[PDB]
Amino acid sequence: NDFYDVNDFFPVQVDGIESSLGKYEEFAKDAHEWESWNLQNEDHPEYPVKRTKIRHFTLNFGPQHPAAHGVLRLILELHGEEILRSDPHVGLLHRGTEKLIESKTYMQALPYFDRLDYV
Amino acid sequence: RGILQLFGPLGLWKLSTFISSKLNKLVFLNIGFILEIIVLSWLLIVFKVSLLKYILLLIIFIIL
Ligand SMILES: CCCCCCCCCCCC(=O)OC[C@H](COP(=O)(O)OCC[N+](C)(C)C)OC(=O)CCCCCCCCCCC
């Protein structure tokens, strides 16, 4: 689901567990203490392992980075040092040029274009 | 069917079940558990060997 998550060898039918001093059910109400009496091996692929979904290291290649040519919140999701998913967050410099040009003449709208690319 | 069964298969099944119940608790994966017994056994070297019978008496007491 959202917060946590939960074969080759034959499924082997074994029933009628017995010891030398009785049956499995005779000492069932006492064997939880006995760690050597458990019937759920930990190598089984179907063994119930319930582990929380701890999110991966998501460094922010954020606005305050010299590599950034502006203000870019580059949300990088990385495991180890490889790159899994990248979601750039543009808009930290949305001055709304397209909205302002609609209210200014064709001569007055020219200086807006020099401010698109600084170079 | 009386004392010779208490001093026999029926009586010895109780004693074996009692002792084997205590033992099966000891076998459990724990580094701290196995560490103390190793350190505890170092007391055998320290004690004068005239005191082995007392440790044997004490060890039986802890079984209970
Ligand atoms: C010095 C004189 C020597 C004489 C011979 C030795 C004594 C006879 C013992 C026979 C027991 C038997 O046969 O074990 C059979 C018994 C129980 O029987 P069960 O099948 O579980 O039936 C009972 C079923 N209940 C209980 C579920 C109702 O199992 C045991 O307790 C296993 C441990 C046996 C310990 C043997 C120690 C021997 C020490 C001998 C030196 C003192």
**Distance separating alpha carbons of residues B35 and B49, to the nearest angstrom:** 23
DSSP character string of A67-80:
T-SS--EEEEEEET
**Distance separating alpha carbons of residues A29 and A24, to the nearest angstrom:** 10
Identify any residues that bridge with A88 across adjacent strands, giving them in sequence order.
A74
Cβ separation A34–B25 shorter than 8 A: yes
Give yes or no for a contact between B14 and B6, defined as CB atoms under 8 angstroms apart: no
DSSP percent split of chain B into helix, strand, coil, nearest 5: 85, 0, 15
Task: Report residue A79 as tokens.
Answer: 């495991």
* Elucidation technique: cryo-EM
Q: What is the experimental resolution, given in Å to one decimal place? A: 3.8
The residue whose CA is least distant from atom 14 of ligand 1 is: B9
B17 chain-A contacts, CB cut-off 8 A = 21-22
DSSP class of residue A66 equals: T
From A15's Cα to the closest Cα of chain B, the distance in A is: 22
**Distance separating alpha carbons of residues A66 and A20, to the nearest angstrom:** 73
From B7's Cα to the closest Cα of chain A, the distance in A is: 17
Compute CA A36 distance to the chain's CA centroid, rounded to the nearest angstrom. 36
Cα B16 to averaged position of ligand 1 atoms, centre (Å): 9
